[PDB]
Amino acid sequence: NLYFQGADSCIQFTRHASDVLLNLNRLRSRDILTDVVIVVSREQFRAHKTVLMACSGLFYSIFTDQLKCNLSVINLDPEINPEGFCILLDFMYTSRLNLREGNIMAVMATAMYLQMEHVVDTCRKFIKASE
Amino acid sequence: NLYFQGADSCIQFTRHASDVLLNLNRLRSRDILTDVVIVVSREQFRAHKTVLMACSGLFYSIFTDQLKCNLSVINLDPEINPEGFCILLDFMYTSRLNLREGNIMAVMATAMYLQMEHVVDTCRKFIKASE
Ligand SMILES: [Cl-]
Ligand SMILES: [Cl-]
């Protein structure tokens, strides 16, 4: 089946959470109900605020701030690597982190700035083994 | 670990999709960046439009319509069971469908109206066995 009897007294759907994520990424690709532009240097990234808050400590702190919550444009540190930000934004919407020899230092730096501890620790483990 | 080497050339996070969903539901509980009220009879339900679109064919068709996309209040058929709608909205944010003897006919009716085919079929399978 596509369902199971859960630990509690409830039916649970195995692929629902991943299907929601697939569909939110389809909304992103088509620029449907995106409500913010993240600007890193000269590059821009359109996204959904709630997805950003659900993945990053920094975006949650930003969009829970009463002054900043309704801003349509958010500028990040111009020192942040745009490729490293792109890889992380793609991870947020797909669960796949395209970690390579060339990008690993910039992805770790960006995830530290974005407060994405799971990705931060995973980068460290791959750096300790590649040494 | 919390990651695996995927089918493609990429690292994938096992719990990411479910963690995103847990966090979007925490945003809902706290009424953070909810952008629509769904009104069923006298009851109201606050939600995030993108979550609704990612789960229901009806909400996707509604919020992709240029006239209706920026509406903050959506009224459903006053004949729709509020309990049945509540169970489905909770499923959307949790993956758990609290299906009971008393609610199964109203949950199926509501999921048909909301174009949630996975839930519709699952209701039918439980009705064919309970007969
Ligand atoms: Cl079962
Ligand atoms: Cl691995």
Coordinates of C-alpha atoms and ligand atoms in Angstrom, one line a residue:
Chain A
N1 CA 0.0 0.0 0.0
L2 CA 0.7 3.8 0.2
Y3 CA -0.4 3.8 3.9
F4 CA 0.4 2.1 7.3
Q5 CA -1.1 1.8 10.7
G6 CA 1.0 4.2 12.8
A7 CA 2.4 4.0 16.3
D8 CA -0.7 5.9 17.5
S9 CA -4.3 5.1 16.5
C10 CA -4.0 6.6 13.1
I11 CA -3.4 5.9 9.4
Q12 CA -0.3 7.4 8.0
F13 CA 0.8 8.1 4.4
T14 CA 4.4 7.0 3.5
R15 CA 4.9 9.3 0.5
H16 CA 2.8 12.4 1.6
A17 CA 5.7 14.6 3.1
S18 CA 7.9 14.0 0.0
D19 CA 4.9 14.6 -2.4
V20 CA 4.1 17.9 -0.7
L21 CA 7.8 18.9 -1.1
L22 CA 7.8 17.8 -4.9
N23 CA 4.6 19.9 -5.4
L24 CA 6.1 23.0 -3.6
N25 CA 9.2 22.7 -5.8
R26 CA 6.9 22.6 -9.0
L27 CA 5.2 25.8 -7.6
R28 CA 8.7 27.3 -7.3
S29 CA 9.8 26.3 -10.9
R30 CA 6.6 27.9 -12.3
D31 CA 7.0 31.0 -10.0
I32 CA 3.6 30.3 -8.4
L33 CA 2.8 32.2 -5.1
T34 CA 6.5 32.9 -4.5
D35 CA 6.5 35.9 -2.1
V36 CA 10.2 36.8 -1.7
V37 CA 13.4 37.5 -3.7
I38 CA 16.7 36.6 -2.0
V39 CA 19.5 38.7 -3.4
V40 CA 23.0 37.4 -3.2
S41 CA 25.4 39.8 -4.9
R42 CA 24.1 40.3 -8.4
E43 CA 22.0 37.1 -8.4
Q44 CA 18.4 36.8 -7.3
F45 CA 16.4 33.7 -6.1
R46 CA 12.6 33.6 -5.9
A47 CA 11.2 31.4 -3.1
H48 CA 8.3 30.8 -0.7
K49 CA 8.9 32.4 2.8
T50 CA 7.4 29.4 4.7
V51 CA 9.7 26.9 3.0
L52 CA 12.8 29.1 3.9
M53 CA 11.6 29.4 7.5
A54 CA 10.9 25.6 7.7
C55 CA 14.6 24.9 6.6
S56 CA 16.7 27.8 7.9
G57 CA 17.1 29.3 11.4
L58 CA 18.1 32.7 9.9
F59 CA 15.0 32.9 7.6
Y60 CA 12.7 31.9 10.5
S61 CA 14.3 34.7 12.7
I62 CA 13.9 37.1 9.7
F63 CA 10.3 36.4 8.8
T64 CA 9.1 36.2 12.5
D65 CA 10.5 39.8 13.0
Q66 CA 7.4 42.2 12.9
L67 CA 9.3 44.7 10.9
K68 CA 10.8 42.3 8.3
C69 CA 8.0 39.7 8.0
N70 CA 6.3 41.5 5.0
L71 CA 9.5 42.5 3.1
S72 CA 9.4 41.2 -0.5
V73 CA 13.2 41.6 -1.0
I74 CA 15.9 40.1 1.4
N75 CA 19.6 40.9 0.8
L76 CA 22.1 38.4 2.2
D77 CA 25.8 39.1 3.1
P78 CA 27.4 40.1 -0.4
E79 CA 30.3 37.7 0.6
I80 CA 28.0 34.7 0.6
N81 CA 28.8 32.4 -2.5
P82 CA 25.7 32.5 -4.9
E83 CA 26.5 28.8 -6.0
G84 CA 26.6 27.7 -2.3
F85 CA 23.2 29.5 -1.7
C86 CA 21.7 27.9 -4.9
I87 CA 22.7 24.3 -3.8
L88 CA 21.1 25.0 -0.3
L89 CA 17.9 26.5 -1.8
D90 CA 17.6 23.4 -4.1
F91 CA 18.2 21.1 -1.1
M92 CA 15.4 22.9 0.8
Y93 CA 12.9 22.0 -1.9
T94 CA 14.2 18.6 -2.9
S95 CA 16.1 17.0 0.1
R96 CA 19.1 16.5 -2.2
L97 CA 22.3 18.2 -1.4
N98 CA 24.7 18.3 -4.4
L99 CA 28.0 18.3 -2.4
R100 CA 31.2 18.4 -4.5
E101 CA 35.0 18.8 -3.9
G102 CA 34.8 22.4 -5.3
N103 CA 31.7 23.6 -3.6
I104 CA 31.9 21.9 -0.1
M105 CA 33.7 24.8 1.6
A106 CA 31.2 27.4 0.2
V107 CA 28.2 25.2 1.0
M108 CA 29.3 24.8 4.7
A109 CA 30.0 28.5 5.0
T110 CA 26.5 29.4 3.6
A111 CA 24.7 26.7 5.8
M112 CA 26.4 28.2 8.9
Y113 CA 25.2 31.7 8.0
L114 CA 21.6 30.2 7.2
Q115 CA 21.6 28.2 10.5
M116 CA 21.1 24.8 8.9
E117 CA 22.8 22.6 11.5
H118 CA 22.1 19.2 9.7
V119 CA 23.9 20.3 6.5
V120 CA 26.7 22.0 8.6
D121 CA 27.4 18.7 10.4
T122 CA 27.2 16.6 7.2
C123 CA 29.7 18.9 5.5
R124 CA 32.1 18.5 8.5
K125 CA 31.9 14.7 8.3
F126 CA 32.7 14.7 4.6
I127 CA 35.7 17.1 5.2
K128 CA 37.1 14.9 8.0
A129 CA 37.0 11.8 5.7
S130 CA 38.5 13.8 2.6
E131 CA 41.5 14.8 4.8
Chain B
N1 CA 23.3 8.4 9.4
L2 CA 20.6 11.0 8.5
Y3 CA 21.8 10.8 4.8
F4 CA 22.3 8.3 1.9
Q5 CA 23.9 8.2 -1.5
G6 CA 21.0 8.5 -3.8
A7 CA 20.2 6.8 -7.2
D8 CA 21.8 9.8 -9.0
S9 CA 25.1 11.4 -8.1
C10 CA 23.7 13.2 -5.0
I11 CA 23.5 13.0 -1.2
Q12 CA 19.9 12.8 0.0
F13 CA 18.4 13.5 3.5
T14 CA 16.0 10.8 4.8
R15 CA 14.1 13.0 7.3
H16 CA 14.2 16.4 5.4
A17 CA 10.7 16.2 3.7
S18 CA 8.9 15.1 7.0
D19 CA 11.0 17.8 8.9
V20 CA 9.8 20.6 6.5
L21 CA 6.2 19.3 7.0
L22 CA 6.6 19.3 10.9
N23 CA 7.9 22.9 10.7
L24 CA 5.1 24.1 8.4
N25 CA 2.6 22.7 10.9
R26 CA 4.4 24.5 13.8
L27 CA 4.0 27.7 11.7
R28 CA 0.3 26.9 11.3
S29 CA -0.3 26.2 15.1
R30 CA 1.4 29.6 15.9
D31 CA -0.6 31.4 13.0
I32 CA 2.8 32.4 11.4
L33 CA 2.6 33.7 7.7
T34 CA -0.8 32.0 7.2
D35 CA -2.4 33.8 4.2
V36 CA -5.9 32.5 3.9
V37 CA -9.0 31.6 5.9
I38 CA -11.1 28.7 4.6
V39 CA -14.7 29.1 5.7
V40 CA -16.9 26.0 6.1
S41 CA -20.3 26.9 7.4
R42 CA -19.7 28.8 10.6
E43 CA -16.3 27.5 11.2
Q44 CA -13.0 29.0 10.0
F45 CA -9.6 27.4 9.3
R46 CA -6.4 29.4 8.8
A47 CA -3.8 27.9 6.5
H48 CA -0.9 28.5 4.1
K49 CA -2.1 28.7 0.4
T50 CA 1.0 26.8 -0.9
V51 CA 0.4 23.8 1.4
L52 CA -3.3 23.7 0.3
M53 CA -2.2 23.8 -3.4
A54 CA 0.4 21.1 -2.8
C55 CA -2.3 18.7 -1.4
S56 CA -5.6 19.5 -3.1
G57 CA -6.5 19.8 -6.8
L58 CA -9.3 22.2 -6.0
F59 CA -7.0 24.6 -4.0
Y60 CA -4.4 24.5 -6.8
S61 CA -7.1 25.4 -9.4
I62 CA -8.4 28.1 -7.1
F63 CA -5.0 29.8 -6.2
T64 CA -3.7 29.5 -9.8
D65 CA -6.8 31.5 -11.0
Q66 CA -5.6 35.2 -11.7
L67 CA -8.8 36.6 -10.1
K68 CA -8.8 34.3 -7.0
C69 CA -5.1 34.0 -6.3
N70 CA -4.8 37.0 -3.9
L71 CA -8.1 36.4 -2.0
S72 CA -7.6 36.1 1.8
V73 CA -11.0 34.4 2.4
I74 CA -12.2 31.3 0.5
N75 CA -15.8 29.9 1.2
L76 CA -16.4 26.2 0.5
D77 CA -19.8 24.5 -0.2
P78 CA -21.8 25.1 3.1
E79 CA -22.8 21.4 2.8
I80 CA -19.2 20.2 3.4
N81 CA -18.8 18.7 6.8
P82 CA -16.5 20.9 9.0
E83 CA -15.1 17.9 10.9
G84 CA -14.3 16.1 7.6
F85 CA -12.5 19.3 6.3
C86 CA -10.6 19.6 9.7
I87 CA -9.3 15.9 9.4
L88 CA -8.1 16.6 5.8
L89 CA -6.4 19.9 6.7
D90 CA -4.6 18.1 9.6
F91 CA -3.6 15.3 7.2
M92 CA -2.2 17.9 4.8
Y93 CA 0.2 19.2 7.5
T94 CA 1.0 15.9 9.2
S95 CA 0.5 12.9 6.8
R96 CA -1.8 11.3 9.4
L97 CA -5.4 10.7 8.4
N98 CA -7.6 10.1 11.5
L99 CA -10.2 7.9 9.7
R100 CA -13.0 6.5 12.0
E101 CA -16.3 4.6 11.5
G102 CA -18.3 7.8 12.2
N103 CA -16.3 10.2 10.0
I104 CA -15.3 8.0 7.0
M105 CA -18.3 8.9 4.8
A106 CA -17.8 12.7 5.4
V107 CA -14.0 12.5 4.9
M108 CA -14.4 10.7 1.6
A109 CA -17.1 13.3 0.4
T110 CA -14.8 16.2 1.4
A111 CA -11.7 14.7 -0.3
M112 CA -13.7 14.1 -3.5
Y113 CA -14.7 17.9 -3.4
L114 CA -11.0 18.8 -2.6
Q115 CA -9.6 16.5 -5.4
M116 CA -7.4 14.5 -3.1
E117 CA -7.4 11.1 -5.0
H118 CA -5.0 9.3 -2.6
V119 CA -7.3 9.8 0.3
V120 CA -10.5 9.2 -1.8
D121 CA -9.1 5.7 -2.9
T122 CA -7.9 4.9 0.7
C123 CA -11.5 5.7 2.0
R124 CA -13.0 3.3 -0.6
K125 CA -10.6 0.4 0.3
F126 CA -11.6 0.8 4.0
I127 CA -15.4 0.9 3.1
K128 CA -15.1 -2.2 0.9
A129 CA -13.5 -4.2 3.9
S130 CA -15.9 -2.8 6.5
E131 CA -18.9 -4.1 4.4
Ligands
CL1 CL -3.0 -0.8 6.9
CL2 CL 26.7 8.0 2.7

